[PDB]
Design a binder for this molecule. Structure first.
Ligand SMILES: Cc1ncc(C)n2nc(CCc3nc(N4CC[C@H](C(F)F)C4)nn3C)nc12
Ligand SMILES: [Mg+2]
Ligand SMILES: [Zn+2]
Length: 314
């Protein structure tokens, strides 16, 4: 068992270390890619291989066949986390390394392709059970479910309190993927960085830094090669526009983001998004973790590609 290191073909073995890596269209290799990432950022010791394989496959089963919030997104977001963890070797604890790749794999579990807002206006049962971060509290809830299935406790070797710390890291990490919470979280971090109050030994500071990392991994489609960025945007809008249709079915005008009638304004919508969300996100993250700069650089390159689309040059 212990002498069994997962290895990847040469092009993957090299490119998986880069922020901009695309996990590819071969579904059946994504589990191997994830285990490869856990082994290298954590050790072959972190998890019993049989248990982790059974956990990876139960997680996969519990993502749905929606255009964007799907199993490929889960593995994409984990690979970004893996790049961050490997470019900041010594800044993170053994538990953080363990908890965060799992958090990323699990962070959109059982997503239905609809925003918290649509669940609230539809009056979905999840919206009574969880008034804020509706889907994100569901995602953590599903994570705990899969962990408690026979033969799925990958954290079995942890002490009662180490186990509690790691489930607490996953919960806070998954909650942070609620983009409503990101704005405030980044503002606080900007201020603490600049007044020089930012302290990585302050647990509530680390928490904030991990939440910014989670937003960064979650938005990582904007840090890819242009053709990956552009084709992921089509999946993103395919969800948003179905939500827009469902909003109209309830007798509600959707926000412009979700109206397929406003297809032509996508380039301008992306600009706003890169300016309002992505750039500030990767800027503040680069300030706090200097070696994540390639994400900011790749983000600025894609903003510049959407500007070209608007100018009729693409
Ligand atoms: C790439 C990416 N990654 C992650 C996330 C969550 N998002 N969210 C978006 C949507 C961005 C957006 N599009 C619009 N539209 C376009 C047409 C409308 C116009 F007519 F008004 C307004 N507004 N905004 C804000 N892109 C991404
Ligand atoms: Mg989500
Ligand atoms: Zn996500």
């Amino acid at each position: 068992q212990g002498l069994m290191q997962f290895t990847l073909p040469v092009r993957l073995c090299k490119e998986i270390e880069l922020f901009h890596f695309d996990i590819g269209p071969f579904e059946n290799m994504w589990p191997g890619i994830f285990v490869y990432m856990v082994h290298r950022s954590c050790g072959t010791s972190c998890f019993e291989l049989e248990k982790l394989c059974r956990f990876i496959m139960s997680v996969k089963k519990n993502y749905r066949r929606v255009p964007y919030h799907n199993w490929k997104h889960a593995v994409t977001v984990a690979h970004c986390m893996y790049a961050i963890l490997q470019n900041n070797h010594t800044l993170f604890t053994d538990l953080e390394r363990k908890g965060l790749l799992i958090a990323c794999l699990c962070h959109d579990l059982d997503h239905r392709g609809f925003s918290n807002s649509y669940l609230q206006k539809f009056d979905h049962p999840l919206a009574a059970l969880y008034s804020t971060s509706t889907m994100e509290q569901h995602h953590f809830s599903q994570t705990v479910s899969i962990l408690q299935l026979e033969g799925h406790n990958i954290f079995s070797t942890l002490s009662s309190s180490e186990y509690e710390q790691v489930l607490e890291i996953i919960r806070k990490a998954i909650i942070a993927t609620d983009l409503a919470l990101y704005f405030g979280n980044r503002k606080q971090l900007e201020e603490m960085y600049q007044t020089g109050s930012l302290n990585l030994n302050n647990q509530s500071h680390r928490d904030r830094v991990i939440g910014l990392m989670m937003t960064a991994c979650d938005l990582c489609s904007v840090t890819k090669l242009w053709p990956v960025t552009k084709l992921t945007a089509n999946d993103i809008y395919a969800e948003f526009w179905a939500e827009g249709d469902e909003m109209k079915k309830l007798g509600i005008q959707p926000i412009p983001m979700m109206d397929r009638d406003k297809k032509d304004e996508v380039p301008q919508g992306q600009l706003g998004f890169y300016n309002a969300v992505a750039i500030p996100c990767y800027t503040t993250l680069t300030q706090i973790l200097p070696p994540t700069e390639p994400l900011l650089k790749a983000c600025r390159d894609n903003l510049s590609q959407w500007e070209k689309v608007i100018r009729g040059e693409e």
